[PDB]
Amino acid sequence: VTQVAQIMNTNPVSITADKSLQAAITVMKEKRVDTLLVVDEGNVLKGFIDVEQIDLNRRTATSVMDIIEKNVFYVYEDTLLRDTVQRILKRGYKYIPVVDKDKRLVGIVTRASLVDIVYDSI
Amino acid sequence: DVTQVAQIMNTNPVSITADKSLQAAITVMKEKRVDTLLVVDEGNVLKGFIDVEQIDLNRRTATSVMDIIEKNVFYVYEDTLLRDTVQRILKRGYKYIPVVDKDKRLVGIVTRASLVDIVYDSI
Numbered sequence: 001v002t003q004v005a006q007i008m009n010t011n012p013v014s015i016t017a018d019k020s021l022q023a024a025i026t027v028m029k030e031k032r033v034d035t036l037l038v039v040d041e042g043n044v045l046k047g048f049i050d051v052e053q054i055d056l057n058r059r060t061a062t063s064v065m066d067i068i069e070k071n072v073f074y075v076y077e078d079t080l081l082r083d084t085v086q087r088i089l090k091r092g093y094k095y096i097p098v099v100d101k102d103k104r105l106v107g108i109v110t111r112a113s114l115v116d117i118v119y120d121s122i
Numbered sequence: 123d124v125t126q127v128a129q130i131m132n133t134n135p136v137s138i139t140a141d142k143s144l145q146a147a148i149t150v151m152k153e154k155r156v157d158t159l160l161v162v163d164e165g166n167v168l169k170g171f172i173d174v175e176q177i178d179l180n181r182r183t184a185t186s187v188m189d190i191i192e193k194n195v196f197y198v199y200e201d202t203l204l205r206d207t208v209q210r211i212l213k214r215g216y217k218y219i220p221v222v223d224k225d226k227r228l229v230g231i232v233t234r235a236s237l238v239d240i241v242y243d244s245i
């Protein structure tokens with residue numbers, strides 16, 4: 001039935017991995033998010049960074065790459081919703097980033113995507 | 123060391139009261155972009171919380187917010203040391219932590235986006 005592209009939120013907060021921690025937290029505070037999704041010049045999703053990793057490696061870390069986690073679970077645009085929801089609800093994932101066939105960052109399914117979904121079913 | 127929660131907590135936590143319907147609740151949740159509502163009475167005293175989850179499960183046989191409230195809330199007072207409440211979210215897996223004044227009145231919560239603030243101050 002329904003795909004993720006339908007309900008996903010089309011404004012996932014990204015930063016490039018050339019940018020400093022000073023700059024990364026700057027965005028994170030403005031945008032009200034505990035992570036950043038890492039993305040290259042052409043917007044191919046590459047990893048994520050944590051607020052914690054910023055805090056553990058702050059003294060000897062100058063940049064976003066210095067602390068990047070490249071093993072992100074993303075899910076393609078046209079995947080079935082049920083699966084990604086099932087992952088977040090039960091398998092503990094905090095949100096699931098959404099890409100296109102070129103692995104370009106295109107959306108996020110946050111817990112407030114579950115609201116959207118539950119709101120619609122009334 | 124000696125910094126409190128009140129200093130940092132974000133002072134707009136999303137409440138609802140126990141009369142409101144599920145239709146009413148999920149409305150507030152969507153607007154505000156939040157997976158849970160905190161439950162407060164006429165005089166704003168913290169009582170519990172409801173989820174997207176429970177709203178989703180009990181939809182068919184549940185008209186009111188009270189029908190599915192979770193009365194057992196971890197909460198903390200305004201003047202608790204930040205350090206303890208922060209250490210709870212981080213390594214004890216609490217999703218966020220509601221802060222009350224000494225009359226158990228919701229005055230704030232401490233989100234994962236309260237940590238950024240902390241980490242931002244430290245630089």
Ligand SMILES: Nc1ncnc2c1ncn2[C@@H]1O[C@@H]2COP(=O)(O)O[C@H]3[C@@H](O)[C@H](n4cnc5c(N)ncnc54)O[C@@H]3COP(=O)(O)O[C@H]2[C@H]1O
Pocket residue numbers: 011012013014032033034035036037094095108110111112113134135136137155156157158159160217218231233234235236
């Ligand atoms: N009664 C209430 N009053 C006030 N707030 C309430 C509340 N009940 C629940 N919440 C908050 O709702 C937020 C929504 O969770 P969600 O997974 O959509 O949203 C999460 C997370 O999925 C999202 N996020 C993280 N990295 C992101 C990125 N790179 N792009 C977009 N979103 C990101 O940022 C949000 C930050 O988590 P946080 O715990 O700060 O914020 C949570 C939680 O603290």
